[PDB]
Amino acid sequence: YIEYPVLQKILIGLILGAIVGLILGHYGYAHAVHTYVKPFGDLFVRLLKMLVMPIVFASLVVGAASISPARLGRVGVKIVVYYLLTSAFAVTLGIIMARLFNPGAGIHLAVGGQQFQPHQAPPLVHILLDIVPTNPFGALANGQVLPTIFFAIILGIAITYLMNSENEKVRKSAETLLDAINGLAEAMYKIVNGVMQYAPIGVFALIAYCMAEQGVHVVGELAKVTAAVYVGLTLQILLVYFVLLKIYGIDPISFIKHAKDAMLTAFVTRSSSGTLPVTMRVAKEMGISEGIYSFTLPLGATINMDGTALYQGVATFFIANALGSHLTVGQQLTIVLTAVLASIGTAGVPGAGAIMLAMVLHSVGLPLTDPNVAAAYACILGIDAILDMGRTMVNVTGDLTGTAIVAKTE
Amino acid sequence: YIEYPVLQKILIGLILGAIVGLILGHYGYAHAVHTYVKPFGDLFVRLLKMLVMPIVFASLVVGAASISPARLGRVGVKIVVYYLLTSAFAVTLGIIMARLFNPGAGIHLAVGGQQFQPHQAPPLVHILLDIVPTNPFGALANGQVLPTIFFAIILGIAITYLMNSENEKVRKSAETLLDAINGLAEAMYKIVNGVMQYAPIGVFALIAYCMAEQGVHVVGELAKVTAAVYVGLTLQILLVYFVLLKIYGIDPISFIKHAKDAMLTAFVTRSSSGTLPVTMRVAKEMGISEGIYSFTLPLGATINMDGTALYQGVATFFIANALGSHLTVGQQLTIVLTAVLASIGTAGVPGAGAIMLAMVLHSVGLPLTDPNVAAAYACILGIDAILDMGRTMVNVTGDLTGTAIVAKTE
Amino acid sequence: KYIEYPVLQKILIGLILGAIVGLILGHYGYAHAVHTYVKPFGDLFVRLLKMLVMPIVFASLVVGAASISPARLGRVGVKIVVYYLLTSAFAVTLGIIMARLFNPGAGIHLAVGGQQFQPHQAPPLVHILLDIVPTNPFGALANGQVLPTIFFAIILGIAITYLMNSENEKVRKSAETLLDAINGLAEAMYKIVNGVMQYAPIGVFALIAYCMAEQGVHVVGELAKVTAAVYVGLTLQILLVYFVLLKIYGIDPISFIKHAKDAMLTAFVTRSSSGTLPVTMRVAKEMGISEGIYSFTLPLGATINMDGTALYQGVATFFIANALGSHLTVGQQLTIVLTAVLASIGTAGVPGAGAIMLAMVLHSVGLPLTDPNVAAAYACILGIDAILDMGRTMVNVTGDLTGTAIVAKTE
Numbered sequence A, B: 001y002i003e004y005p006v007l008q009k010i011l012i013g014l015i016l017g018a019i020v021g022l023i024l025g026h027y028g029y030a031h032a033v034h035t036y037v038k039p040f041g042d043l044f045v046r047l048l049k050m051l052v053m054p055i056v057f058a059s060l061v062v063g064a065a066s067i068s069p070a071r072l073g074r075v076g077v078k079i080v081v082y083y084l085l086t087s088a089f090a091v092t093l094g095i096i097m098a099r100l101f102n103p104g105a106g107i108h109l110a111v112g113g114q115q116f117q118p119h120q121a122p123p124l125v126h127i128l129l130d131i132v133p134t135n136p137f138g139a140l141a142n143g144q145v146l147p148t149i150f151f152a153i154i155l156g157i158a159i160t161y162l163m164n165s166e167n168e169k170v171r172k173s174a175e176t177l178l179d180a181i182n183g184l185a186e187a188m189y190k191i192v193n194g195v196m197q198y199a200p201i202g203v204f205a206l207i208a209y210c211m212a213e214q215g216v217h218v219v220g221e222l223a224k225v226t227a228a229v230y231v232g233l234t235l236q237i238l239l240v241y242f243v244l245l246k247i248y249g250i251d252p253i254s255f256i257k258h259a260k261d262a263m264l265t266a267f268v269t270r271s272s273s274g275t276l277p278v279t280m281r282v283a284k285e286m287g288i289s290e291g292i293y294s295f296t297l298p299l300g301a302t303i304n305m306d307g308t309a310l311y312q313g314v315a316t317f318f319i320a321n322a323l324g325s326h327l328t329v330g331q332q333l334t335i336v337l338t339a340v341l342a343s344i345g346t347a348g349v350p351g352a353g354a355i356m357l358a359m360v361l362h363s364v365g366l367p368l369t370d371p372n373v374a375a376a377y378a379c380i381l382g383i384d385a386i387l388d389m390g391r392t393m394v395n396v397t398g399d400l401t402g403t404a405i406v407a408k409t410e
Numbered sequence C: 001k002y003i004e005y006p007v008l009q010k011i012l013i014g015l016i017l018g019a020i021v022g023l024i025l026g027h028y029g030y031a032h033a034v035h036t037y038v039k040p041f042g043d044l045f046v047r048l049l050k051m052l053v054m055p056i057v058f059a060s061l062v063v064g065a066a067s068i069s070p071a072r073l074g075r076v077g078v079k080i081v082v083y084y085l086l087t088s089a090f091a092v093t094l095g096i097i098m099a100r101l102f103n104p105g106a107g108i109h110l111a112v113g114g115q116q117f118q119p120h121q122a123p124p125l126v127h128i129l130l131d132i133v134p135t136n137p138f139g140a141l142a143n144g145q146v147l148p149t150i151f152f153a154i155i156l157g158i159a160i161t162y163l164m165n166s167e168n169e170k171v172r173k174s175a176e177t178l179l180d181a182i183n184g185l186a187e188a189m190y191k192i193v194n195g196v197m198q199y200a201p202i203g204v205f206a207l208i209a210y211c212m213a214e215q216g217v218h219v220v221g222e223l224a225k226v227t228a229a230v231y232v233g234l235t236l237q238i239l240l241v242y243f244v245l246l247k248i249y250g251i252d253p254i255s256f257i258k259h260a261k262d263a264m265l266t267a268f269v270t271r272s273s274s275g276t277l278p279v280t281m282r283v284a285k286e287m288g289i290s291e292g293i294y295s296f297t298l299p300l301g302a303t304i305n306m307d308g309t310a311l312y313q314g315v316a317t318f319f320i321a322n323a324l325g326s327h328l329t330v331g332q333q334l335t336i337v338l339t340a341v342l343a344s345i346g347t348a349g350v351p352g353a354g355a356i357m358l359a360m361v362l363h364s365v366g367l368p369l370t371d372p373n374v375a376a377a378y379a380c381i382l383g384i385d386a387i388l389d390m391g392r393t394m395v396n397v398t399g400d401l402t403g404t405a406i407v408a409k410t411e
Ligand SMILES: N[C@@H](CC(=O)O)C(=O)O
Pocket: A270, A271, A272, A273, A305, A307, A308, A311, A346, A347, A348, A349, A350, A351, A352, A353, A354, A388, A389, A391, A392, A393, A395, A396
């Protein structure tokens, strides 16, 4: 009986969660909320957590095979260099956005009864080294997001080199495997949309609790982050796209004139993908060559989400702050590096980057298996659909921009 | 040098195990049996244990893709509804069969020196929740039958939805994967028949011991179960099939008249599969439409083993009773739910349902990694080929019945 | 990266140049400068190999087992696998007796944890056999467990083939696409070998910049001792094993080498059993051998049938035993024979294949690479690998040309 505008569907359980919560954080005892409504956001949280392991790894084998030299011609060398440098700046700017806003801190929580401890971050030599997983199976098997990453990328570059192989038997294998890995990837996102369908219930319970148990003080903080994000996203559009459209030859204000339909679709769809027969239509409607908008636009569909990278920058900081954790330089620029990858393999479905955030949380020090960490995560997971729209939308823009700059080079 | 009627082959080591045992549980010291002949049933037990994990999972991804809406047309909606409601009643009736007989209890054993403890079955909220595996890889990797299941069925439903996909790249992946997962499944059953070949040795040692060390008191108890099963199987045939054949239009006593050859083959083959060019032949020799007996008969080959579902009902109870464990309501109707699935993905080979029993043992509270549990399992594993015949046979009948009732609807 | 040279000479450069930056800094300077600074670079190397060890035991053996599996090979190949299996089996026997003559390692006595290597107590036979049917195959791979992993590979790869014999199509296509996927893991995994093998000069540099830094000059001999124990076993294999049965059948054994010159030298410098196949099959035709005979056997001997590796894995397991202070027992003696047969059977035939695959046979005698001491002794002999890899690679290639010629006479 449940099938509605799947974005409005959430926004309904969200403004209506905040309200069933807030009041039962008065008249009633939110240990009625705690015992009864809470397990439902938990069923939600977990269902995502599930996907986090397959879809880090499955994704990155695929996505790594997407860029791998020598697997892309020089028409695509001159676009990946763009994609990589653009989405890297985006997280830099997400860090500096959430460095301006203190999104979270003062939302101080300590769920175990004890405040989050950071287990002692060890000698550099070991921390680097300790990421070549000694048994890659083990890595996936239990947890280990980092090695699991290094092992995906390593495989995914190898995978491609076997398609270059002078041998047939070797190539058909190499392929059928790369195929099977994708399809895991895909089927795994199919499960995302699965859970995303449970999402209204889940998101209901999630801020029926942030409102129930964090008082009204969270409301601001949740907004503070939204602000930190959007005002960074449009700070990205202005200080980052318009900045280099002007550098090359494309009239930057009129760029938006033709690219209107794409971005709005990207916004309300909350799916970088959904907006591609809208993006490529727009792409043709601005001089762009058949072969150029055929490579780049549907490759920027998955790889190249500046909107996600900035998101995962401000999200990692919202968790740091939540816990009571000084996110250190170094682990600063880890966020830059890890949210680049974290973006690179973020689906471009509905709630992709919220799951993929785990990867970058995990890599700075905050493992989702840590009551405190996974509390601060369960919170920002509640205002995700609200970020997912500006997010999705920039992600789509960033492909139209790069397509246009490299169009000028050809 | 060993190649005989592979069913008579076992029944030889079985009546000749019970005899080498029983006597060496007198004149000689069955700590000669314990040290010398026993490791040979163990090599057997383990070899099955091995398969249990791949073939729960590989099976259920495949088998879930077999039913998954929307993957089956309404000709098969009107048969799966049958299959699911029939095999469900079968375990209900298996529970009530072994509720009448006390198959096991008084076979009280305590192998660790200590009697089986049940580790404390925790808060409902957690027990449900705690089956969305947090890392699917982990789940399989170490043990975890339940989540492993949930994740199978969740994947296999997703898998199918990608074949519905408007995209080609997406469908070919989705396929090659679903292909690879099968073939695991298959190659895994190939290993079953492997082990099943060692089985005569294995089954020899198994009741050369139940006879050596349990006294003669077991002999009855082993029969008690056989009784509890067969008199449940033919109680199924009479009170369940004849009951609804009479409800629709098919003359129920004459149904058996044409279906003779199928059932006997099913009996001696001990392979639901072997009996399909025999089942479909009989299916044509009773008015059934080419398209109807083409869908349902070879789909009832794997899915829809009323005979297995009942088996796993009475087996779970034989272990409960063996240990000294009151199998509780709830975990009662768990057995109903779990042995439905446990049946749904039971191979339809030789010794399929014996392995797949673990899945349903495991799910009530008795994990095969618990000396006591896996002692009670190693015993009933010895009279498996004796059940496997009545079992196999009903499984085959249940497809011919459903085919005939849904034939009347068309 | 600017780094692309004769990839074998490339290593031999960082090796004679490691030994020299090491040796001296084990005087003037304090090799706790070496220890803190240059050492992690060999470790990045060691680890990168270790990575591969698990996939490429398993992926390899599923494939390789499907290579032999009856009934998957006709009687033209029955009469060659029987050769291959008996030849490579004797090779490790001869590797054991080579390193039984030389004491390669011992007196290189090390105890890294501060404590000397303990052997954890090798349990009742019944359990030790039994305990190799992995109870959860996933578990096995997942965490470590080389032996079961193997048993489970070989068990699958035999089954895999049986499904291709299947009267059913749906059953065969699956069976295949899977057996395809598993290969390609296999293959992609060895692509990663060559990857690491490219880092190798750095890695090998650091590795004996240390064995030279911290083991004094005493190691230098010991490292050579092994090389000796290997080569003088390899050419003891050629003379006492090949020439011995070429003379038994009909082929003039000294003139055999006359036509097979080009193949062996290529095999030597390539350090790649595979690279030397359009060289091996060319020579194979230039000695009467039938089109159908040298088409089956030579490129099947490419991967399966590395006498040169089997002997290597024999002397290597002994170099580790000796290093630690471990009496390698009979039983675990003939384990080495059995395990280095398989260990060879699925050794890639790439560059540094058999060094990785050694882990499989170390692991199966009692020395698990997860044991500081064990994986110290391993990191050492890993440094003089490219030096062995040449004689090794080369014999591996010879042994296919021999078997091809003997079974040629039978046809
Ligand atoms: N919302 C983004 C992906 C993400 O969730 O980060 C998109 O689909 O475009």
